[PDB]
Paper text:
Herein, Moesziomyces aphidis DSM 70725 aromatic dioxygenase (MapADO) is characterized through X-ray crystallography, biophysical as well as biochemical assays, substrate docking and mutagenesis. MapADO features a seven-bladed β-propeller fold and a Fe2+ center coordinated by four histidine residues and shares a conserved structural motif with homologous enzymes despite low sequence identity (<38%). Similar proteins were termed aromatic dioxygenase (ADO), , apocarotenoid or alkene cleaving oxygenase (ACO). These enzymes primarily act on aromatic compounds with a hydroxy group in 4-position and use a mononuclear Fe2+ iron that is embraced by four histidines. O2 is activated by this nonheme iron and reacts with the C–C double bond of a substrate, eventually leading to C–C bond scission and two carbonyl species as the reaction products.
Acetate bound in product-free crystals formed hydrophobic interactions (L41, F340), indicating stable but nonspecific coordination. MapADO features a seven-bladed β-propeller fold with an Fe2+ ion at the active site coordinated by H200, H251, H316, and H510. Although MapADO presents two molecules in the asymmetric unit, biophysical analyses suggest it is monomeric in solution: It eluted at 9.6 mL upon size exclusion chromatography on a Superdex 75 10/300 GL column, indicating a protein size of ca. 60 kDa which is consistent with its theoretical molecular weight (62.8 kDa). MapADO’s catalytic pocket lacks a conventional substrate access tunnel. Instead, it features a confined cavity closed by three Phe side chains, unlike other CCO structures with tunnels leading to the catalytic Fe.
Residue numbers in the entry: 24 to 548
Amino acid sequence: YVHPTDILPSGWPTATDLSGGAQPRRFEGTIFDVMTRGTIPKELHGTFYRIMPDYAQPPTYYKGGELNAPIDGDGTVAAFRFKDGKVDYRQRFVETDRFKVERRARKSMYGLYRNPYTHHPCVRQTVESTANTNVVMHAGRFLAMKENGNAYEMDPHTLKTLGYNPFNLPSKTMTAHPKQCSVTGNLVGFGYEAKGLATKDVYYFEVDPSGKVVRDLWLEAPWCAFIHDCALTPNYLVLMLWPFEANLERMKAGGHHWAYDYTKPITWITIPRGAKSKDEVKYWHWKNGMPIHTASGFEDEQGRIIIDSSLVHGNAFPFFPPDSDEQKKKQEADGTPKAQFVRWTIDPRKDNNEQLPDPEVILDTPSEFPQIDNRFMGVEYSSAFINVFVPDRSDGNKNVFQGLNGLAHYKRKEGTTEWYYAGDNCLIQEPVFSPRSKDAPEGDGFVLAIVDRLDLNRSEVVVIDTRDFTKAVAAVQLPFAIRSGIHGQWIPGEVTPDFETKGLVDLPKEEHWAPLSQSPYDPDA
Ligand SMILES: [Fe+2]
């Protein structure tokens, strides 16, 4: 049986998200008092903000959208606010300059990921960011980020877009993976391609809790590399270079911004915090592979930089293949690479020209989207909350972003790993952590994540108490599915302006519309 209306043509190209799912959602609005199952912990007082790529218009401008990437689509923020056991939800697109152009024209006007030579001529000199990868609340300001532009600011309650580049960074870009230092409170980050397309320039900065840039430095990467993420330590910001290179000639010819290169080693740039000269920066190298995200970093008792990350032993973004014929044939032959969670040691006393030691395998399972207890951000940390392919219950042949059906709570100090299974016919997305109280022990509290109930065409938020990581205490049940996203963050109400007085949904007025005389009821009858 085929439903006759299902053979009527659609004008939509296949617009995937990182999970591989391709259903456009695109709604903007609210649900007040979202249905829950179980008991919402009274200790949750804040908002889980998650951001997702969800092209608002069918992305047909270049090559009919055939080469759209899962990381391309217009950023939309979902907010789930927990207060006193009750949850509200709001979904809204970021009003990026790109989104505004395309909605006003009711037309796709942009081409390939990060390639202005494939956008419509009238928009080539716009900010092309879709602000779709991560969010942060810093200095009272709520930001949507994507690494090919500065951030867009949004109201944290209505999600209305307020402006661009709120911290007035001088670079053309800001990472979507800045880190909020637990010691200083600074937002510590960088922007690469910081002087425009295919530039090697990197701008490092720290923005203090009042919104002021208090430390910065201009430097360069060894090649124009895809510097997605970083790790913060007490004395360093360490940039993590993936083995992709940008080529302006390729982009002018209409090809992809990035191409994977098997000959590039994973490379790290150490930036001493508050450095005064680019001469203080050092480049360190291992071997080829793709460490997608850091959990965090710290310095050990001997001052050595320790960083945990995912590690895919090959290209986890196969939609940006190599440039050369020989390397393309290797990618196709290899298919899905081995994927693990690992630990790197960079000893600053060593000669940085010597190859780094091989990383230690921490989890021998495909692992991605790690987060930590941010009370330990930029210092020694132990807990990591990791999105995993659950051992013996997962499909190792899926790309790392497409088979994530569990969570792990890894504790370095104890050496233990606990496991949460999302369920049969379920995926689960990146976890976030909220401490049980401000002075709870590290990693004691609640873990939240979005679950795709694939057989039900719905999405839910699960809530897990770390005292039993294997069991959900509550589920927030939406009446529909949302896109599978990239990152999200738990943002405590304490740091959210006006959290005490403003909900995600504004209340209707108190006064009745109708006069007293219209009631059916008479107290005398
Ligand atoms: Fe990321």
